[PDB]
């Protein structure tokens, strides 16, 4: 059908999607599918023939705020369904920020990238001596792209 956006509480998109799915199953709502990417915070995607079905499905839930008044083209959310490694798309020599891990809130420079083990080796920029460290690909965020 048509892709619609539902604004939900940040960090609790999966539970809201599960409640919407259970309500649709129990009450026979005309809901086609629900997509809740982990990278997107506070927003979920629901496929329905019309926005009235989405509005009727999300009502009665404290954690579903409102439905965005618009229709998303499928090309915008097409890349979300494709499975790609988090390490891929990273090149050595640039600067990244570590969102999670033991090095939370630290800037680092990418040194080595390998897609086989899904790990990326980075060097802290604030360290007085270069100490390479191995961190997960999804933990880092690209601040700038140079070389």
């Amino acid at each position: 059908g048509k892709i619609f956006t539902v604004s939900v509480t940040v960090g609790q998109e999966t539970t809201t999607a599960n409640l919407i799915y259970s309500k649709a199953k129990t009450y026979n709502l005309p809901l086609y599918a629900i997509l809740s990417p982990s990278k997107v915070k506070g927003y979920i995607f629901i496929e329905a023939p019309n926005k009235s079905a989405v509005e009727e499905a999300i009502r009665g839930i404290r954690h579903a705020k409102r439905v965005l008044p618009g229709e998303i083209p499928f090309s915008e959310i097409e890349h979300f369904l494709e499975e790609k490694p988090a390490v891929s798309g990273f090149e050595p020599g640039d600067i990244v920020e570590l969102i999670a891990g033991p090095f939370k809130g630290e800037k680092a420079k990418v040194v080595r990238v390998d897609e086989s083990k899904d790990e990326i080796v980075v060097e802290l920029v604030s360290s007085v001596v270069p100490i390479p460290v191995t961190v997960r690909g999804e933990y880092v965020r690209l601040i700038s792209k140079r070389q």
Partner: protein, 645 residues
Amino acid sequence: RETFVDDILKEIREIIVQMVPREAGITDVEFEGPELVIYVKNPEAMMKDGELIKNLAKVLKKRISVRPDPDILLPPEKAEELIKQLVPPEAEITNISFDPSVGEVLIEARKPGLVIGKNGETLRLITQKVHWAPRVVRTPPIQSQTIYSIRSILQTESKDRRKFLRQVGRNIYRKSEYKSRWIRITGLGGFREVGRSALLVQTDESYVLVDFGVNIAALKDPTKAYPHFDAPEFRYVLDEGLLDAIIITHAALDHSGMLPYLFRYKLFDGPIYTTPPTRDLMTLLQQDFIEIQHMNGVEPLYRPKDIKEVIKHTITLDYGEVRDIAPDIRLTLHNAGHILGSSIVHLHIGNGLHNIAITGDFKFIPTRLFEPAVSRFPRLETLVMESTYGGSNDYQMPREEAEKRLIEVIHQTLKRGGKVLIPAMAVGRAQEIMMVLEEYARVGGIEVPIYLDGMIWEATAIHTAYPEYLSKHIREQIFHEGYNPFLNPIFKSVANSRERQDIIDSGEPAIIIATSGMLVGGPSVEYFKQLAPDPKNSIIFVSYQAEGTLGRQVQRGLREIPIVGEDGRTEVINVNMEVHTIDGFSGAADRRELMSYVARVRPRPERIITVHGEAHKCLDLSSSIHKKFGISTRAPNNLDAIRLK
């Protein structure tokens, strides 16, 4: 990696329930660092005497820590009342703390010997009548800020400390007694150089780092200020988190300066095995180093929270206590005699496979402060020795005439009404000077007050907190007699700048022991500035003065020194005071002392490694040892790996 800690714990529990009578009621058996903890419901039957605990410790070859079950716990007020009633009034108990999570009561007393008992029977009596496992620590006669802060940090983070100890105990006993296929020794720093010491002990199962330190002389160059972080073995150990433990020989910046840096960037998460005096002194020195780097305007190496994390990850070991820090490595500490808490690291890898002794900084002659270094070991194959004074012509003067000259110079200065200013290190020579002065003044030689400014008072308090780590004479005076040499009324502490100004402006003679040997900071510079024009005063140098420092300028004989004034104009200091230099109070071992230690060590090591000194000095010491005793000697450079077995 694969672990078998559960099977080992099950076997240990089976052995315990086979040996311990059933009436004890054993509930839980777990590992807390390098010691075993057993929880029972009837402590009376478990420890009616020390023979059962001794037999259990001998059979299991572990440190047994019997604790009551948390369900059977007396109320804290009733427990405190019972503990106070049981302990004799001679032992003045100051603070009592309780741990609701695990059965343990911390007792702070001025006389821990009475609380512990003649053979530990008082601890058993307390934990039987009160159902609380007792831990006794000494309350120092002089209050120490660092020790109080460390104790408060340990008490306020009990849950994190217990979790860290449980993780360390699980990691240590991941497998049973394992015979290492090979033993490797690599030096990441401190090899053929002075400072930034770093020793890595590598086996096929566990890795051990020894005295991770920093260099202050070459702090401008990052390639020489810090140990070699680019070593492939060290990189592999740090990246995979295979570092089992870190052991610090003694509390100095060249042996413990780089320790908080690992915790700053979360490069390490295991335990640190130092003596409590070493831990306290190294925390004080690291805090002072961070403050100095902050004041100089440069970027600090780490933060005080990193020092707090180092405190939270430190396990305290006493002298002569054997603990298992790895599946194949056993660690014990022996007295070194260099400074307070200085320990010679002895590693027992395997079940008699090999033995390594890392002396570090040590002294082999008796001193006024500490006993000479331990030269007897149960087994010794490889010896790692310092070479600070390894030169052939390096011969420090004997102590007795050096202290006689110091005493006569001080007496001559005080005879004419002058003031004696003695710049000194925060730890080491300063306490020896205070002990010599106290001995001289105890017979009524001098009545003038002795003023300690800066870190001298804190170091003195830390020294008072651990009298068992001192020499036999001071131990006999403190324990057998009622006299404490550090508690002499002549020793006074100046609180603020007003007290220092009153001391300077006072016409009465006095002795001032500052905390900066090079007159590069602290109250030493102010004392020198305000006492230089007076010809009656004198300044005594007890340490080497580096080039480019004010102290070297005064020592060389400069009558006037141009300095920057408060208003931004050049100021001239007229040095009319007498200048003296007595370098006989150095805590480092002499070349003759090193040769005597090599000759008198038992058993004779198969090989000797000379480190911690200049390259030519290390080579000269190794060649002299090889020519005199025939033992094979090596003086490897940095990033050099030696396969001992």
